[PDB]
Amino acid sequence: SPMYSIITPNILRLESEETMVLEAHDAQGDVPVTVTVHDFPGKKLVLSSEKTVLTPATNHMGNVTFTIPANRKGRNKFVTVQATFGTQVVEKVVLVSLQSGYLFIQTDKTIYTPGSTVLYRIFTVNHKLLPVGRTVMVNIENPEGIPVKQDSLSSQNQLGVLPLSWDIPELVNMGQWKIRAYYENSPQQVFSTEFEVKEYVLPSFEVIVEPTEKFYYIYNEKGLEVTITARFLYGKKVEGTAFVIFGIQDGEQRISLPESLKRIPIEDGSGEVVLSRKVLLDGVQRAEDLVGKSLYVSATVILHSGSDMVQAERSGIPIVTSPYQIHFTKTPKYFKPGMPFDLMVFVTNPDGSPAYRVPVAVQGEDTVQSLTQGDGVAKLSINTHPSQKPLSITVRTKKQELSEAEQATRTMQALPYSTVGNSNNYLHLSVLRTELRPGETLNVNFLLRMDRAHEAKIRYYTYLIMNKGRLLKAGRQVREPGQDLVVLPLSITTDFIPSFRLVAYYTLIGASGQREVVADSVWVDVKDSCVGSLVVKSGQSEDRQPVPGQQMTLKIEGDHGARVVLVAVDKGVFVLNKKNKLTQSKIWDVVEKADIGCTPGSGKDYAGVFSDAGLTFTSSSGQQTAQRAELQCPQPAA
Amino acid sequence: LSVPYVIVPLKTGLQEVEVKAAVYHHFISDGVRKSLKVVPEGIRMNKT
């Protein structure tokens, strides 16, 4: 029974190459395959090309790379993929995204004075972060959301870099300005970057306000301890006097605490201030109530010369009962009955930043333990029984120095993998989760689960790779009869960045001449770093600090053929505003948010594994996945 | 060490203040020629 299946990204994209994995099970000889794509509904033939032949020398796996043109509301538009395997035709409708790529705006400074010039560059790249030549529309709005200047340049042959500039008139409103840009082929998708306009003057020293703890324990007698560090822009320590105050925040409203105002000296460029719990409680009129709210510190340092003055501020200090938080957002919500289930505990501090080195465990198994890595994820693994009853797991932090009362707990519920016709045939993919780095190799484990009556029928696994919303690679993993565990040497390149998924499935005939498909997906995180590398150090491999007006060599170590844009800014500027900058970490954070996968791994059934990994399965036997018609992932239902 | 200086702007526009200083016995020095905006007497307003 020749089974012709097809797999394409859950959501296709315009003006981009999307892969399409063709297949043919139990097929003899060759087979002429013709892939075609039409608009929906009706027929307009957006792409008729791309035809290949499945050779038995390749285990009958095809590979067709296609591209959907433009030829241009509120309702999504769909396309109809049509793969004809010789005579038998198999078609499936897929959602299409109007997103052509991303746009990154960069401004030299973070704040500008009325009369100066703003230098901003627009980076134009695709979904693969590779430069591209398109038409970009750039506007500039004032604080009251009113466009004043609009351009229409093209990154054609400009290597994806659009240098621009605009002079700010003396007569203009101060506040928060915004620069909005978007591709001409997608007005709905707009990117923006803000720059403040204010009449200011660069100070001569910065002020840092760091509380001992990145939070506050309500039952802490000592109180909120805060350290005031002040140093000149050139590094030298600062001598002066600081004025520090506190307050409580509630959503958007702030309540100052006049009785917390302190005036501490600043010697050796350091200061020490404490907010006693007594004054805090007296600030209101039920300590357990303040739980959830936040505290903010407002310092103000003045030199002993009374020449300069700087105002700093730390806001967002959480008031919680436990110094930690647990999230099962990186743990699959489906387990395999009678198979080792992996738990990816995600411990984080009250603020949101991952917590390093914090032991965790399960409700039972007092002996089981695991520490948290640098990413904020712990490695846990439990053995389940062949029961089709939901598995309830409660993970408990086991960090010493504290008590069972100061610990944070969380409970989740995993559901068994529903096998087609209750045949109890499962597939588990266990991954040695460590901080993956481009260049290493990953040991992908394939654990089979089925009676021997049909185990000899399984001879290969079909795995696919998901990356940035596209099919990176797809191959076959051989399997000999009697093997429940086979390893797949998957080499990690610079493409897997940031995160890549791995779906694996097998198909056979059993039970009662009924076609069955079993799958399992897994989401792994790779080290977050530059796809290549870019370093900027001092050319002078010797000497000390330069002198105003002096020259200095500036070494730049980057990739060959790459263009590098530079910019130097006085640190004094960041003392007034350090927000809305451009960081490589902020880039990956955006890429990850645009992921089509909405599950750490596994699923309720075979049709769920693919869908929960950002894939669509469709065969000639009938086994298909759940219809997806919603752009965003599931509305996070706690 | 701070050093006071009383001045009175006479003409509007981007004017220029310049101070220099040298140490005795030591052969070191440094002058600063910064510029400050000199605006007349009035108040902002946005009449419709």
Ligand SMILES: *[C@@H]1O[C@H](CO)[C@@H](O[C@@H]2O[C@H](CO)[C@@H](O[C@@H]3O[C@H](CO[C@@H]4O[C@H](CO[C@@H]5O[C@H](CO)[C@@H](O)[C@H](O)[C@@H]5O)[C@@H](O)[C@H](O)[C@@H]4O)[C@@H](O)[C@H](O)[C@@H]3O)[C@H](O)[C@H]2NC(C)=O)[C@H](O)[C@H]1NC(C)=O
């Ligand atoms: C999905 O589809 C992808 C695109 O078709 C496939 O990617 C290719 O797969 C191979 C194997 O992984 C890639 O790796 C190597 O390619 C290099 C050699 O450089 C290539 O030249 C090739 C051959 O052209 C000609 O071949 C004939 C026959 O030998 C010669 O007569 C002639 O002289 C010349 O060699 C190109 O076809 C080729 O791809 C490169 O340009 C080779 O040294 C390795 O042995 C291996 O073949 C290959 O680069 C991929 N193609 C790319 C990246 O463009 C992929 O196999 C398929 N599978 C999935 C799901 O990924």
Ligand SMILES: *[C@@H]1O[C@H](CO)[C@@H](O[C@@H]2O[C@H](CO)[C@@H](O[C@@H]3O[C@H](CO[C@@H]4O[C@H](CO)[C@@H](O)[C@H](O)[C@@H]4O)[C@@H](O)[C@H](O)[C@@H]3O)[C@H](O)[C@H]2NC(C)=O)[C@H](O)[C@H]1NC(C)=O
């Ligand atoms: C012409 O003059 C008028 C006043 O005659 C200006 O309108 C507004 O004037 C008031 C009072 O000075 C300003 O209130 C300030 O608001 C800021 C920030 O809060 C604001 O919130 C509103 C509504 O959400 C936004 O529209 C603003 O952008 C801003 O976010 C607050 O921090 C201060 O405490 C102060 O109360 C107001 O900002 C100002 N309107 C502005 C700047 O948009 C008007 O600006 C000026 N020119 C024109 C034609 O707009």
